[PDB]
From a paper:
Here, we show that Pseudomonas aeruginosa OprC is an outer membrane, TonB-dependent transporter that is conserved in many Proteobacteria and which mediates acquisition of both reduced and oxidised ionic copper via an unprecedented CxxxM-HxM metal binding site. As indicated by the successful structure solution, OprC contains a single bound copper and shows the typical fold of a TBDT, with a large 22-stranded β-barrel occluded by an N-terminal approximately 15 kDa plug domain that, like in other TBDTs, completely occludes the lumen of the barrel. The copper binding site comprises residues Cys143 and Met147 in the plug domain and His323 and Met325 in the barrel wall. The CxxxM-HxM configuration, which coordinates the copper in a tetrahedral manner, is highly unusual and has, to our knowledge, not been observed before in copper homeostasis proteins.
Since Cu(II) prefers histidine nitrogen as ligands and Cu(II) binding sites often contain one or more His residues, we also cocrystallised the H323A mutant with Cu(II) and Ag(I). One strong anomalous peak, at the high-affinity binding site, is observed with Cu(II), supporting the SEC data that the histidine is not required for Cu(II) binding. H323A (approximately 30%) and, in particular, M147A (approximately 60%), have relatively high occupancies after copper incubation and SEC, indicating that these residues contribute less towards binding. All 4 residues in the OprC binding site contribute to copper binding, but not to the same extent and, in some cases, not equally for both copper redox states. By contrast, removal of His323 still allows Cu(II) and Cu(I) binding.
Residue numbers in the entry: 67 to 443, 453 to 723
The structure:
């Protein structure tokens, strides 16, 4: 029976696995963050119509470790207008995996909050054959998506093409105002795979993508988000009796971004930027991974190394005051400001004691350097390099109850994250006493305890996952004051965090089903005896479902508490806290019909009751567009969408 997705269970301890090709009930804006909105734990900062910044249990930014096909794609805007999830079209992947908390060491450094894994799976052709999947979505406000996934091959290897094109106009809020929010996005990507015998795979991949998006939050819109990307991966299997797998992969991703104030808006003569202005930035990322999995019937061991160089450059437009001329950014040389390296080694080990007891541990050690290539701002850290060695690891114990189909789990984790591009270069001020941020921001050290349970019964599925943690040298942003616009200062503080997520799924009759989910996050700034900023409020979802093995309808109610813990004028590189937030409820409806084996119809109405509201985390709306300099960007009002999936 064909459904429409509205939440995801925790399928295993701390681990959520979904297929991002299923329709989702608050229809996602064709980016990475909106596909995480359905998973309890995740909030999204809103910037406009798309390209939100994702947040997991209140943690922001590089604390989330988002990988696409094992590789890592970093954007270039100093103010994270193109966060790593903005280059992702989840409709083109096949699997989405979320691992909550510092509880894997297999996928790179600094995963304090969690790991997110969008991946393509290799084809499985036997005889000579072909396969086409395609989808079309029309919705309110000029929403149109077009998605294609096609492949061909036999048992010796395959060609696969995936690609999408998606766009929408400005949406409107619960009060009929239109919000600066149009966007456009395309992606094209090729993969060639060689399977010379059943144990061997060599796959080669490349693609490009591009997009634009109007940003209600910011003083500039994204007129270009160019992506060029390349990858190679080698996998052998059954190398020996113990050696079960050897994986090597190299990835190259390149981001090339243009933000300006004149292509998607007109400059605004009251603001700090009253003339046409364009900012061009790029980000070149090269990395790879080598890994061996060993298996001997009571133990599994995975050992590997991984590396990563990333480079960052900028160049602006000019504008002559006495001529009204305007020279563009591409008429000038790129100016490097930062290069980052990381090398790491890792080991993860599982013990299958009995069949109701499981022990997992992992360790990883990291060498992480950054060089500051800025010559001026003169620059007291010009051409300075700095590094650190960061041990990280975790232990998880899982035990199944002999009685019921219940699983309990507890785990302890410790993660050290080196500061990222935004934490060292983007803040105009560093800590009191510092020459700048690059010199003094210390790495972040998180120590967290994760616990929860699973119940998979006949009519009743349920899961919970809680966390408690301290964070030493949490990298906090303080906007505090303005002097020519708002300027930030990065600092290090100690903090306490705690929260959890739970959910439940009950089968009423054979056709009727209802589910629920709750998500909480709490955070204290222990160094200053106040709350942590940018924490989302407690939130709850209720769904009702009718399936008749041919077609289904669904109802959804999202209920969100107010947030009364705020730390005004503090936050991250993207947003600051200003006001306690109002709660709200939003109701939604969906159906689905299987027309034939190949053609599946879906449709929904989002926010049926046209609620006027704003999430706590959304950006502070511009004021060049009519906002009171602090009101946050409003969520869309009533919206309809319809989608056809065909798989011939
Ligand atoms: Cu920008």
């Amino acid at each position: 029976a064909p459904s429409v997705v509205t939440g995801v269970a925790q399928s295993s301890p701390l681990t959520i696995v979904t297929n991002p090709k299923e329709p989702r009930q608050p229809v996602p804006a064709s980016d990475g963050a909106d596909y995480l909105k359905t998973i309890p734990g995740f909030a999204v900062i809103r910037n406009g119509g798309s390209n939100g910044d994702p947040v997991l249990r209140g943690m922001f930014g590089s604390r989330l470790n988002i990988l696409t096909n094992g590789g890592m794609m970093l954007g270039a805007c100093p103010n994270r207008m193109d966060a790593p999830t903005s280059y992702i079209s989840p409709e083109t992947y096949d699997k989405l995996t979320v691992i909550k908390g510092p509880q894997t060491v297999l996928w790179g450094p600094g995963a304090s909050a969690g790991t997110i894994l969008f991946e393509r799976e290799p084809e499985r052709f036997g005889e000579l054959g072909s396969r086409v999947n395609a989808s079309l979505l029309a919705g309110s406000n000029g929403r149109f998506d077009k998605v294609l996934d096609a492949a061909a091959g036999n048992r010796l290897g395959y060609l696969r093409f995936t690609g999408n094109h998606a766009q929408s106009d400005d949406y409107e809020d619960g009060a009929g105002n239109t919000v600066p929010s149009r966007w456009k996005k395309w992606n094209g990507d090729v993969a060639v795979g060689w399977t010379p015998d059943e144990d061997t795979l060599i796959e080669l991949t490349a693609g490009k993508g591009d997009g634009e998006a109007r940003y209600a939050g910011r003083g500039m819109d994204g007129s270009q988000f160019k992506r060029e990307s390349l990858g190679l991966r080698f996998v052998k299997s059954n190398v020996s009796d113990v050696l079960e797998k050897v994986e090597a992969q190299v990835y190259y991703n390149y981001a090339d971004a243009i933000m300006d104030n004149f292509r998607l808006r007109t400059p605004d003569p009251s603001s700090m930027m009253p003339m046409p202005m364009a900012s061009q930035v790029d980000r070149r990322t090269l990395g790879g991974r080598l890994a061996a999995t060993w298996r001997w019937d009571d133990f599994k061991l995975v050992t590997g190394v991984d590396a990563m160089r990333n480079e960052h450059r900028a160049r602006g437009s000019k504008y002559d005051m006495m001529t009204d001329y305007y020279t563009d950014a591409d008429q000038f040389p790129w100016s490097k400001d930062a290069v980052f390296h990381n090398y790491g080694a890792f080991g993860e080990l599982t013990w299958f004691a009995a069949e109701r007891d499981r022990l997992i541990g992992g360790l990883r050690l990291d060498r992480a350097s950054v060089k500051d290539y800025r010559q001026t701002l003169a620059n007291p850290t010009a051409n300075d390099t700095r590094a650190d060695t960061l041990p990280s690891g975790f232990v998880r114990y899982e035990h199944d109850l002999a009685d019921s189909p219940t699983t309990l789990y507890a785990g302890l984790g410790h993660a050290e994250r080196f500061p990222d591009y935004w934490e060292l270069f983007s803040p105009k001020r560093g800590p009191n006493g510092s020459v700048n941020a690059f010199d003094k921001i210390k790495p972040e050290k998180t120590t967290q305890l994760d616990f929860g349970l699973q119940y998979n019964g006949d009519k009743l599925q349920a899961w919970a996952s809680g966390y408690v943690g301290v964070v030493q040298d949490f990298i906090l942003f303080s906007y505090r004051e303005g002097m020519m616009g708002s300027s930030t200062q990065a600092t290090n503080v100690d903090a306490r965090i705690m929260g959890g997520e739970l959910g439940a799924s009950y089968q009423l009759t054979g056709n009727w089903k209802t589910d629920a989910s709750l998500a909480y996050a709490w955070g204290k700034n222990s160094s200053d005896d106040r709350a942590l900023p940018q924490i989302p409020p407690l939130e709850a979802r209720f769904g009702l479902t009718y399936e008749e093995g041919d077609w289904s309808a669904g109802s959804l109610w999202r209920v969100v508490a107010p947030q009364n813990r705020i730390a005004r004028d503090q936050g991250n590189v993207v947003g600051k806290d200003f006001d306690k937030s109002a709660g709200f409820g939003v109701f939604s409806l969906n159906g689905a019909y299987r027309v034939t084996r190949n053609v599946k119809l879906s449709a929904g109405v989002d926010n049926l009751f046209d609620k006027d509201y704003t999430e706590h985390l959304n950006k502070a709306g511009d004021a060049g567009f009519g906002f009171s300099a602090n009101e946050t960007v409003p969520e869309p009002g009533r919206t309809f969408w319809t989608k056809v999936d065909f798989s011939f």
